[PDB]
Design an enzyme around this catalytic site. Structure first.
Site, PDB file in Angstrom:
ATOM      1  N   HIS A  52      13.141  -3.938  15.438  1.00 43.37           N
ATOM      2  CA  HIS A  52      12.308  -4.574  15.812  1.00 43.37           C
ATOM      3  C   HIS A  52      12.853  -5.655  16.867  1.00 43.37           C
ATOM      4  O   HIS A  52      14.158  -6.227  16.439  1.00 43.37           O
ATOM      5  CB  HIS A  52      11.423  -5.571  14.680  1.00 43.37           C
ATOM      6  N   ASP A  55      14.816  -8.604  15.116  1.00 39.34           N
ATOM      7  CA  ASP A  55      15.780  -7.794  14.162  1.00 39.34           C
ATOM      8  C   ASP A  55      17.070  -8.052  15.218  1.00 39.34           C
ATOM      9  O   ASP A  55      18.067  -8.451  14.553  1.00 39.34           O
ATOM     10  CB  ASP A  55      15.749  -6.418  13.988  1.00 39.34           C
ATOM     11  N   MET A  86      13.496   4.902  18.440  1.00 41.06           N
ATOM     12  CA  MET A  86      12.343   4.179  18.277  1.00 41.06           C
ATOM     13  C   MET A  86      12.566   2.729  18.084  1.00 41.06           C
ATOM     14  O   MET A  86      13.596   2.251  17.975  1.00 41.06           O
ATOM     15  CB  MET A  86      11.549   4.760  16.894  1.00 41.06           C
ATOM     16  N   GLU A 179       1.304   2.571  12.158  1.00 39.94           N
ATOM     17  CA  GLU A 179       1.865   2.732  10.928  1.00 39.94           C
ATOM     18  C   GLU A 179       0.628   2.050   9.721  1.00 39.94           C
ATOM     19  O   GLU A 179       0.752   0.795   9.803  1.00 39.94           O
ATOM     20  CB  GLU A 179       3.062   2.030  10.694  1.00 39.94           C
ATOM     21  N   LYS A 181      -1.205   1.000   6.259  1.00 37.90           N
ATOM     22  CA  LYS A 181      -0.613   0.418   5.062  1.00 37.90           C
ATOM     23  C   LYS A 181      -1.874  -0.230   4.163  1.00 37.90           C
ATOM     24  O   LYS A 181      -2.611  -0.924   5.317  1.00 37.90           O
ATOM     25  CB  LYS A 181       0.505  -0.890   5.297  1.00 37.90           C
ATOM     26  N   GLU A 215       3.978   6.517   6.190  1.00 30.20           N
ATOM     27  CA  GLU A 215       5.353   6.089   5.286  1.00 30.20           C
ATOM     28  C   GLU A 215       4.845   6.440   3.800  1.00 30.20           C
ATOM     29  O   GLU A 215       3.922   5.818   3.415  1.00 30.20           O
ATOM     30  CB  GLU A 215       5.665   4.602   5.312  1.00 30.20           C
ATOM     31  N   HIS A 218       3.469   3.379   1.230  1.00 33.76           N
ATOM     32  CA  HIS A 218       2.351   3.156   1.747  1.00 33.76           C
ATOM     33  C   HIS A 218       1.053   3.973   1.429  1.00 33.76           C
ATOM     34  O   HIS A 218       0.308   3.525   0.653  1.00 33.76           O
ATOM     35  CB  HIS A 218       2.129   2.692   3.320  1.00 33.76           C
ATOM     36  N   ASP A 243       8.359   7.758   8.020  1.00 38.20           N
ATOM     37  CA  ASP A 243       9.027   6.625   7.413  1.00 38.20           C
ATOM     38  C   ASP A 243       9.313   7.161   6.110  1.00 38.20           C
ATOM     39  O   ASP A 243       8.213   7.436   5.295  1.00 38.20           O
ATOM     40  CB  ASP A 243       8.465   5.240   7.399  1.00 38.20           C
ATOM     41  N   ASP A 253       4.997  -3.173  -2.022  1.00 36.93           N
ATOM     42  CA  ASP A 253       5.985  -2.044  -1.278  1.00 36.93           C
ATOM     43  C   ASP A 253       7.128  -2.305  -2.019  1.00 36.93           C
ATOM     44  O   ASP A 253       7.769  -3.438  -1.887  1.00 36.93           O
ATOM     45  CB  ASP A 253       5.512  -2.431   0.010  1.00 36.93           C
ATOM     46  N   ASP A 255       9.876  -0.010  -1.299  1.00 35.26           N
ATOM     47  CA  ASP A 255      10.964   0.715  -0.325  1.00 35.26           C
ATOM     48  C   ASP A 255      12.254   1.010  -1.114  1.00 35.26           C
ATOM     49  O   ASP A 255      13.468   0.532  -0.328  1.00 35.26           O
ATOM     50  CB  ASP A 255      11.182  -0.407   0.721  1.00 35.26           C
ATOM     51  N   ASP A 291      12.834   4.004   6.086  1.00 31.36           N
ATOM     52  CA  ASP A 291      12.321   2.693   5.981  1.00 31.36           C
ATOM     53  C   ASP A 291      12.455   2.069   4.537  1.00 31.36           C
ATOM     54  O   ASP A 291      11.290   2.491   4.033  1.00 31.36           O
ATOM     55  CB  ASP A 291      11.208   2.473   6.562  1.00 31.36           C
TER      56      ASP A 291
END
Ligand SMILES: O=C(O)[C@H](O)[C@@H](O)[C@H](O)[C@H](O)CO
Ligand SMILES: O=C(O)[C@H](O)[C@@H](O)[C@H](O)[C@H](O)CO
Ligand SMILES: O=C(O)[C@H](O)[C@@H](O)[C@H](O)[C@H](O)CO
Ligand SMILES: O=C(O)[C@H](O)[C@@H](O)[C@H](O)[C@H](O)CO
Ligand SMILES: [Mn+2]
Ligand SMILES: [Mn+2]
Ligand SMILES: [Mn+2]
Ligand SMILES: [Mn+2]
Ligand SMILES: [Mn+2]
Ligand SMILES: [Mn+2]
Ligand SMILES: [Mn+2]
Ligand SMILES: [Mn+2]
Lengths: 393, 393, 393, 393
Positions: A52, A55, A86, A179, A181, A215, A218, A243, A253, A255, A291
């Site tokens: 990102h 990031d 990506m 994406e 969610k 994802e 999600h 993802d 979420d 992860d 992810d």
């Protein structure tokens, strides 16, 4: 196991870089340097890294700081050989994005989000990324009357189509991947599932270069079948990126690492990515992006353990799924259950709707009671997949 | 309250006719005669009645019995003035449909389901129905390897497109409406939500006459926002019919009366059907169909009480929703929150992607920290909707 | 509806003080001075204020600092008249607590956690609190082999009984209220629902001063009926405190204003708090405390608005709930449905098991098919409740 | 893996006898003769069989008929050696039970229900059952004003203590096992989770012979961790019986084969049944009973296959779970993660509350920031568990 660059395992900078701040607490780990991140990932066998904008480059960095940061970032990549497949934009953390980026009720915030995206498309192209991901995490509401629901979809379309046309205009070799969610951080997020995102793309002007980034966790937050949903994305030729991670149920979420959630479903997800469909059709051949977030209870040895574990899990599952489809008892179990039979068209070559109506044997003279005795043997077929997964066969 | 035929309240024959057999028990009520059903519904103020083929004509009826049954059925309609706005087919109760109709693994069952549909389209046209509903309740699996997921979608497309082309070929004045459901009776149903069904229609050959039939409880079984989902169906010009009822949470399909589930959401669903969007756009103008089941604990007085209650609830909500949007304190609360502002395009007439990139004021010189102070006042706006709903304003 | 101190509306300092940081973003509001919180809450009609040790006194505060803060806060309370009915401990934000306080795997951490609690009991006693709440948010795991589950419950018991024993030894007028939560921040939390909370209490050495603090949203995060859960707590005489807010489904803890989630469930909780049980029974008399968060979209005018919305919602539901039960039509419906018949014991006075088995009328010659004809009319009774809630009656 | 009577695999007559009727369709299989069920189960390796009064003896059976049926069933048992470890009552299928048995609003129905139970206790005692299960499936409501909730719990207590008192008076070697279910067939069921079941038990006059019968899918229908729930039941010494099957999410009761739902959760339940708690504690020694339904898609070869799959799944998970804990690498990881440290009491022997508060080392000079650095390594321990489950170790 042992992963290697042809496996195409990609990791985001924010996954291993996730320091531990959740809603009820502060970070439990020290910030991770991005050059360090590159070096460690390349040493484990990753093929590439994603990020990102914020990031890597602080929201606040001056022009001079961006170039210092990027220089070190590009050298590390050079030194290691990692690709950048990506790139994505942060349109959710700064307080200005509290009602969204593209669908923000405030028009001046909408323009500021669109301009943040346009510039990030330029950096995406410069990095050699093939996919530009869009996660609209603040697009939604807590209250049903907070928005004009039709207007919100026109504002999503204008952003996405402006960004698409800009790619097309500059000739970048990029695709946009939305994406979905269902909720979190908004009470209800627009384009909540794979289906909603797929439908939305068909209303775009530049739909041809827009696809999805499903994802695992999600779709599981809506209690949906992840394999079923990516199958539909694949079938539509819209599965542009993916993802992978784990979720144990309908809740926040999580992860978790891929495979540390719904295990049987992870198996079948690897069977579709690796093997594709029983009767033949489309295949997903992009990167296998992870992810996830390393559990806040563990230190830095857990961060790198967790990154290895994503890769191990996928290679272990892959192995069991290759053995499963190769097994002649499975192939025969499949044939008994009608798996290959579903690949035959319903209508005979040349038959029309009238033809079939008038075919006495498919309706008037059909024995419904005798066709109902068929043992589909789906339980036995499921038992063989699990024994292949438990390494018992 | 007091409903009347211009309200367009339609009821299926199987709703009031539902005798009480659930998974753990037998029927608690006596079968309801369909001529009686017509008479009672017309006496309460309904506009029309809908049915599944086997709701009126037994699976087994001879040709002579079909004509006896239909004669009495058409006379009752004549005697009362009820229309038949929608017709549907039963492809889930007989044991032959245990793996589906259209996506059945057995090819001969697939042909038998398609021929059952084709004939039902002929009866639909004869009744004057404008909508033909498709609920694929047995299309799915309990186990992920039971199906070739791509093949299952090709088999769904062949059935739907054969049926569509048959309508087109015969010039019937009918549209097909698919009805999504996430699970039950199958562990996972194909086209589980509004989104999935919308996406699927764009892959059809005869997509132009295919739209959706969303049902309140069904999207709530995936924990989705019903108003958000019908908004997207509406926005796409695909909202062809609607099924209204209540669900209290993620569990088995309850089919409670409309308004006896998620009350606030029912309010906002009536605001969209009745009022449409704040800034203007599409409007749903079809019938308001109630797909519910009277609780098995109650007798026949409860069946007719329950049918009255669907109509009362919708008229009560309608009233409160007309007062809410009419209220000048609400209009001003809306203006403060940016509801009208979301209707303005992001880009100025004539502005290009490059234009906005280069506009210093929307990016380089933008004050993100000052734009973030905006009080959207969404909580106050929600408080005014609820007070309108509690009849307090 | 204007709240008065008589109403017993209590708020935590952390509720209106919530700054807006979530897992995907930073705070959108500046920190709230506690002195101001107290004066503001006093002007809206609050009865009292509640806090967590670290909401007030920072983790790292020196003694001089603690003293200052306490002097400012006690000043405020003296000036306004607010009571401090409950005090709690923060055993979840500092990284030391990443695996729990009482049930951390590390023993040195378990000892610190318990020390932290004892000191806070002292403070709670000096503030005049009647209730001591324990919310074990970090007690639990993401993975099933992370904990010895019998040992996690012994560790929990050790801490809770040590705290109880200390209260008793010191002669403080404090009762402990345990607060269940099924998940978040941990993947699975120990004592996840009211049921598990109540069960655990019965294994305690000092269970007589240990009860529950159910929170509306927390029971809804597992899909349970909040009104049913608090009725079991009341029935066991273990309803010591209550936390009211709203939740719109199974997802992350929303902490919406009370009444802004499931509306009919809020109606019926208010009825239960206010009217008690239809046949009589215990009644809840403590504070009506709100543990919600002002949506992060809203600025400071939103904060006081939301604080206010909680007390209006409650007062509005109370007016309706009182009207509902006072309605003659409603009382008649309740009688018909057998709501007062439930209160009659099944057996006759001095009728034993043997006496009943032998009663021919109740078994051998009981006419089951005739008994099954009763029309319980639950639908009509629910319709009447909703019409009182919408104020159309 | 070949089951032997030693394994203690028990099955209900209703499990393999399930005919396939669901809410949307009719039975797909013919009725199962009980004599055949017994002989078939004996040939697969079952230890015993279980039933509901009406699974065996029809509701309307004359005395001569009851006698015949019992003679055929006892013959079968004599011939094969199967034990009858548990017997239960059907208080849910007949229309008389539409509002419950013990908690029906109608008192005449409550008396019949209890009479029906007492007679069945007699029978259970003659068959040699050690367990008497109660699943109150119709106890509950669809609507919140349908019940006086304190009175529903008194009514429940009356029936359960009358049944317990009768056992004790008659000198039968029977214990009662209560079985929780959150919803279905009722919208909300009383005593919905293990926690509520355990809580209720403590308010009983005769709670000493009353315990629980948790079912895997039922706890997963509320999203809870089944392994955590049975560990609280064990910890309270109240785990009398267990029902194993699979559930794939929050939805209708699937009753899939054990291991065919959440796989890792099944792994860890088997570990808990077989290995007990890591630091020691009580162990479960009753029957391993399966309450599942052979999918309705499958014919009779599917029925015996599925019966078989239950026992293989269990044996396969047992082999892995035994290997997992015997692995030295695993034991080292458990020690590092603090799984044995949890077993050490927090306090020192004869250390009181005051002694601890005053210990400077534990509070005042405790270094929280240093304690927080521990790497619990829960991720690596979970990775090792999954690698043992996939048999890659
Ligand atoms: O923590 C975050 O940065 C987000 O959770 C992402 O991981 C999004 O899911 C999305 O993939 C990319 O924005
Ligand atoms: O009970 C039934 O007959 C079904 O539940 C229907 O009501 C479907 O939901 C669909 O609308 C029409 O087939
Ligand atoms: O936001 C917080 O600080 C916590 O979530 C608390 O509010 C808990 O819900 C509990 O009621 C008190 O610790
Ligand atoms: O199918 C059935 O007959 C019931 O669902 C039972 O199996 C319950 O689950 C309970 O375990 C026994 O009454
Ligand atoms: Mn995620
Ligand atoms: Mn993602
Ligand atoms: Mn339905
Ligand atoms: Mn429907
Ligand atoms: Mn909460
Ligand atoms: Mn709380
Ligand atoms: Mn079950
Ligand atoms: Mn059971």
């Amino acid at each position: 196991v042992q992963p290697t660059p042809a496996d195409h395992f990609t990791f985001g900078l924010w996954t291993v870089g996730w320091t531990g701040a959740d809603p009820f607490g502060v970070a439990t780990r020290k910030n991770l340097d991005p050059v360090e991140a590159v070096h460690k990932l390349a040493e484990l066998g990753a093929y590439g890294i994603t990020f990102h904008d914020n990031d890597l480059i602080p929201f606040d960095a001056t022009e001079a700081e961006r170039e210092k940061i990027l220089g070190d970032f590009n050298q590390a990549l050079k030194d290691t050989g990692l690709k950048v497949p990506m790139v994505t934009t942060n349109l959710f953390s700064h307080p200005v994005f509290k009602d969204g980026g593209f669908t923000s009720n405030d028009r001046s915030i909408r323009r500021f989000a669109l301009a943040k995206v346009l510039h990030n498309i330029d950096l995406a192209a410069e990095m050699g990324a093939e996919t530009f991901v869009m996660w609209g995490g603040r697009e939604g509401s807590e209250y049903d009357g907070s928005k004009d629901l039709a207007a919100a979809l026109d504002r999503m379309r204008e952003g996405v189509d402006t960004a698409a046309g800009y790619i097309k205009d500059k000739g970048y070799n990029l695709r946009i991947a939305l994406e979905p969610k269902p909720n979190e951080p908004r009470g209800d997020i627009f384009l909540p599932t794979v289906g909603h995102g797929l439908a939305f793309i068909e209303q775009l002007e530049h739909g041809d270069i827009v696809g999805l980034n499903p994802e695992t966790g999600h779709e599981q937050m809506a209690g949906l079948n992840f394999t079923h949903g990516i199958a539909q994305a694949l079938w539509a030729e819209k599965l542009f990126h993916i993802d992978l991670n784990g979720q144990r149920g309908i809740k926040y979420d999580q992860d978790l690492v891929f495979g540390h959630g719904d295990l049987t479903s992870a198996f079948f997800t690897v069977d579709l990515l690796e093997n594709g469909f029983p009767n033949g059709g489309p295949k997903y051949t992009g990167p296998r992006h992870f992810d996830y977030k390393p559990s806040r209870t563990d230190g830095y040895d857990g961060v790198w353990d967790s990154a290895k574990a994503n890769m191990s899990m996928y290679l272990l599952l892959k192995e069991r799924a290759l053995a499963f489809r190769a097994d002649p008892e499975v192939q025969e179990a499949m044939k008994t259950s009608g798996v290959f039979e579903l690949g035959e068209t319903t209508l005979n070559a040349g038959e029309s709707a009238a033809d079939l109506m008038n075919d006495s044997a498919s309706f008037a003279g059909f024995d419904a009671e005798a066709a109902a005795e068929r043992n589909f043997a789906f339980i036995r077929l499921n038992q063989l997949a699990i024994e292949h997964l438990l390494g018992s066969r």
